Design a protein around this ligand. Sequence first.
Ligand code: CLA
Ligand code: KC2
Ligand SMILES: CC1=C(C#C/C(C)=C/C=C/C(C)=C/C=C/C=C(C)/C=C/C=C(C)/C=C/C2=C(C)CCCC2(C)C)C(C)(C)C[C@H](O)C1
Ligand SMILES: CC1=CCCC(C)(C)[C@H]1/C=C/C(C)=C/C=C/C(C)=C/C=C/C=C(C)/C=C/C=C(C)/C=C/C1=C(C)CCCC1(C)C
Lengths: 173, 203, 178, 173, 172, 187, 194
Amino acid sequence: LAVPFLERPPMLDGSYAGDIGFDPVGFSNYFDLRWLREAELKHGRVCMLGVVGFLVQEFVTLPMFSNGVTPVDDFFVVPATGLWQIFFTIGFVEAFSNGFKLTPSDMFADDRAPGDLGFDPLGCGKDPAALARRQLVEVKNGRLAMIAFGGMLHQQLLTKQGVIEQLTNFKAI
Amino acid sequence: EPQGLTAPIVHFGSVISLWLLFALPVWSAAYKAAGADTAEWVGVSQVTEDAPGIGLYGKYAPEYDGPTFREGLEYVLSFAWKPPILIAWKPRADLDRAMMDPARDTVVSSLYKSLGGALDKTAVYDEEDQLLILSDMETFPETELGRRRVAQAEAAGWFTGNPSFGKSLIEYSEETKKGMREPGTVSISAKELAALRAEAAKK
Amino acid sequence: DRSYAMPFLSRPPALDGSMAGDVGFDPLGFSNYFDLKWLREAELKHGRVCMLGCLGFLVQEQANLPLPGFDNKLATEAFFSVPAGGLWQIFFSLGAIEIITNKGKLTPGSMFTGGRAPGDLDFDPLNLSVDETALRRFELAELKHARLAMIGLGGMLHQMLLTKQAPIEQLTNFKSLA
Amino acid sequence: DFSAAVPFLKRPSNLDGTLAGDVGFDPLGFSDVFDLRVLREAELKHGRFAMLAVLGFLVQEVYTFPFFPKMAPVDAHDYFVTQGGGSQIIFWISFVEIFGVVALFELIQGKRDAGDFAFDPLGLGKDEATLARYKVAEIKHARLAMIAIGGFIHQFWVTKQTVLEQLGNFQSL
Amino acid sequence: QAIPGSEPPPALDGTWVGDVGFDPLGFSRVIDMRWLREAELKHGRVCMLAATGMIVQDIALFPGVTKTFGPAKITALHDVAVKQGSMQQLLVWLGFLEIFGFVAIVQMLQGSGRQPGDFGFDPLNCGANTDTLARRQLVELKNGRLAMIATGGMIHHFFLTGKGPIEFITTL
Amino acid sequence: VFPGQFSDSVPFLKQPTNLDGSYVGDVGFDPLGFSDVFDIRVLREAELKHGRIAMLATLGMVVQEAYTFPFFDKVLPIPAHDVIVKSGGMSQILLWTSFAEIFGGIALFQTIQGKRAPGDYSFDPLNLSANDLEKRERYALAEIKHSRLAMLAFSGMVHQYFITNQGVIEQINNFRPINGFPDATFS
Amino acid sequence: YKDGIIQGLGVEAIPGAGRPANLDGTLVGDVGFDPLGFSNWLDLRWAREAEIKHGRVAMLAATGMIVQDAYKFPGFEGEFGGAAMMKLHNLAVEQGAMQQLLLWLGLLEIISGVPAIIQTLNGSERQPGDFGFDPLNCGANPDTLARRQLTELKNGRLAMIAVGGMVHHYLLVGRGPIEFITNIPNFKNPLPPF
Ligand code: CLA
Ligand code: KC2
Ligand SMILES: CC1=C(C#C/C(C)=C/C=C/C(C)=C/C=C/C=C(C)/C=C/C=C(C)/C=C/C2=C(C)CCCC2(C)C)C(C)(C)C[C@H](O)C1
Ligand SMILES: CC1=CCCC(C)(C)[C@H]1/C=C/C(C)=C/C=C/C(C)=C/C=C/C=C(C)/C=C/C=C(C)/C=C/C1=C(C)CCCC1(C)C
């Protein structure tokens, strides 16, 4: 149990990966656990790619754009047009992968697995035991990556330095 | 230097606000658990029951069923426009000139009787209309000389032509509604009279 | 049958002695022409306001909030020194309190129709007055303090209006009238 | 049945003799017309005012408060009209007699004896015989003082000197 | 039986220390007996300590206290010590003790079982046995009344003459 | 002195109604009857929280005067409060303690439901008194005693600084009476 | 004494005439003398009370006329001088003696005579002229009381006539009663200021 001085949440049976009965604020109750699991997986995946993006943008810059001082400021040096292209591409991807159901009500109409958008092009998730292990690994890495992203974004905003650049040039504020 | 939500002042204000917001339910629940409802948490006072001012019941709340608020305001106004002040210096009741021995009269008593005092014998009323105009009209009998004078005048043309000459408006209204047509005249419809006049002037 | 407070006056018909604080002192006979529940409610409200007012009169001259315009010791002048916007905010907050604590029943013809003791606004955070005898003693004490505080607030306000001096300070610096 | 006091006048019909000081004296016969209880209330109030006034004249002539200025009792009346003490005195008299009006109304209704405010704080009169004797003494003193206070005031008006001062040098004019 | 002409109130019916039937005004008719006896013992003990302290102060002072308080005694001593902070300390700590005194009075009035003036302060087990305890109760009450009157006397003597107890009684 | 049942600590006061004696540190001392108005569980949780905070506070009030970190600056703790408020670190202490108290509030609300012991956060990483039960109540008594002592001691150190304007280590080595009373006249 | 030969039906003044019907010889001093018919339209109680009061006031007045002309109280003779009779009234009005006498006698009359008047007119047992003023128990015997009543009535008539005489003597000559009787000739008269 994650919080020993509190009871186990009623809705956390342990079916999902990474469930250690951690929900003191009780979002498991009064909400849809499938919705929360899909939200957690999407946040984890987005931050998981964002951390790699923050790492890459320091040393690798696409020839079309001009690199900013920080990957946070790389958002501003790129034109506003092209940014909305990314926004609309993400909208299309989130519409087609979700089957054009985009609300807490109509989603999970077929009761698919939360976070299962049917994207396994390399076919890695075949063995069910390995599938469960990879589910645990993915959820734990997403939980780590969301904290890591929320940290490195603010470090870059405050120090105006890259993350590896900050680690090699650590200084007080 | 920081201002607004980033300021530490707003930070400790927020933590105090959260302290109060959580102080409502935690101490409400701690109260509901204890409540001081055990049969020893009673108030104490040095005053015994025999002291004046102590009521018989705790919260009485009597049923009123009395005069309205407007009547109470009128009573408060009557405090001003009719206080029971000059009613004190009013003549006694049970005073009459039947038990009051005249052989005991004094200056004030005699002056009070002379000024219409102790007038309990005034139950009599005048019992006179004092606005009654007499209406006992007398009809003079008609003589034979006069019955011969209404004749020889009705034949001569009098009594006809002006039926409302010597009669008042009320007097002429009393007739022409209960009878008494104009003498020497008959009743005929307008169409019949027109036809008769047309036949009279025929050819 | 004579009233205890006025031994020469007859006891008022509505003041039988069941209600707290009753010594038969209604010479003008207000209880004969007004709802005694309304009269007791008004008496208690006036007395509570005056108890808090006397406390404020004694406190403001010794302690004040560290705010601009909030440093006036003379409370009568402090009413005009404090910004009027805050005073009207106090007025509307107390009006909301009046609305809530009376359940929207404000008129004499509706305040006690739902059933409520006079002065019972459901305020006893210490759960006192569960004992009936203790409740009676506390009611007598509350009424006596209410009347004493009405008289005291009137006196202190008039002395502050006349002598232009705050209380206690006036006691220590007693200046007789010219 | 002639009057005990006036041998040549009939005893007034409303003066049975039960009241204190009822000796049968009423030549003009005000008791024949106006209520006897109200008349006794007025008599007692007048007499009490007059007794207090006579005692006050004596004391003021013999001793004045050091914080008050020194002058004769009669001409101090205008001094306290201007100063405001007299306004206070009549204010408190009016306050007492606001309830005095209610007492008079109850006397009219017959629920109170005349002049009986039940004011016996020291418990001097409790025995009925002593109470009657005290009533007779009170009414006699009330009448005597009612005469005496007017005597004091008019003697001051004509001689321009106070009571004991006039008793000092008896100037006749 | 104190005053032969009058009679004691019904609350004064024996079974109390010092009950000689002396209560002509009738305080026990409107005031609870336990509160009255608690107040009597508190006044008596306070005035006992006050009188003994006044005697000791007028006899011998503490080292170094005259350098600060000067030649001030009784009321002048109080007026100086309130500025000194000694009387502030006494007020704070004695009121802190009187908080527990207050809840003791409350529990007595609501029926805990304690008697008026009983704070359980009996070091060395002095006077805790047999009729000696009752005799000590009577002695304490009478000496408290005596000390009350003596304290009033000393205070008014300093008001009138401006001299301490031991020097007023020797310089008439 | 008179016969009757009373509290063990105060001999003239009865044993409080809700202080049965199951909780550690209970010597029957509740004169004003706070346990009669509010639940004993919530009061014990409040007491333990105050006491632990005051333990850490006294240790800090000693150490900061004894030794200050290479960063920050050499300054007395009471003005160090304002210094760190301006520096921004105290806001972060507030944020993190608030994050802990978010779960602390849910713990308190489950204590009202009677699912956890008051003040029991099950935090014994060194298992000093976890496996043994007899040592647990002894350590609970020691903890509550030190909690009360620490609250008193921190209040004392703060109010000694407020009038002496000296550190705690400074005052126990350079003890000076307040207000210049050694040579004060007409005070 | 009430004998029937000094008053009543027996003796009858202006003899050879008839007594008035109302004058039935019952009251004191009835000698049947009432010309001009005053006893027919006037109440005998009111008339007898008026006669008694006039007689008593005239007795007092005549005694005052006699005494003031012989002896004067100390203090008054310095304020008024030698004035007497009809001058003493005008000086006493300004001095204040007459005003005080008027006030006190008027108060006495208001609180004694008028209530007595109305009681005895309306039929009380109080005889006219009777105030019950009998200190020293004079005339306790009924026969002596009737003698005293007749004597008082006759002396009151005498006093009224004598007072009128003295007033006119002063208005003509200008002297007081004993001075007028010791100065019988009408010559050497002083000024009689009214
Ligand atoms: C226009 C409206 C109005 C009406 C209809 C009345 C009607 C009445 N008023 Mg009133 N009043 C009014 C306006 C009005 N008032 C105003 C505007 C005032 C001034 C604020 C007053 C002040 C007033 C007083 C102070 C009193 C009344 C009283 C009365 C009642 C007298 C009847 C009674 O008891 O017989 C008896 C009435 C008598 C007058 C008999 C007394 C006779 C004595 C011997 C007279 C002696 C003289 C005395 C000094 C007063 C005369 C003053 C004169 C010399 C100037 C009567 C119901 C009296 C009362 O008893 O109310 C219940 C009373 O005491 N009124
Ligand atoms: C989410 C991924 C994504 C998709 C799926 C997507 C699809 C297409 C297609 C359809 C097949 C075409 C034909 C097309 C063409 C152009 N793209 Mg897109 N594009 C994406 C990303 C970006 C970004 C990040 C930027 C960008 C831009 C341009 C410009 C330059 C215009 C110019 O030089 O002004 C042209 C001509 C840049 C921009 O618009 O601003 C300069 C720029 O910043 N694009 N793009
Ligand atoms: C106006 C004014 C003021 C004033 C004033 C005041 C208060 C003036 C008060 C005047 C008063 C009270 C006069 C009273 C006179 C009483 C008399 C004459 C009683 C006589 C009784 C007799 C004769 C009894 C006779 C008798 C009778 C019937 C019964 C028995 C037989 C006999 C004994 C003979 C001031 C001072 C405030 C100043 C202001 O600026 C102006
Ligand atoms: C619960 C738990 C488990 C065990 C550890 C521990 C005991 C510490 C305990 C506590 C964990 C804690 C405190 C976790 C804290 C997580 C936090 C503070 C996460 C915050 C993340 C913040 C994020 C992403 C911000 C994202 C902002 C983004 C993208 C966009 C930025 C911007 C760009 C450049 C484009 C334009 C708009 C804008 C805003 C200028």
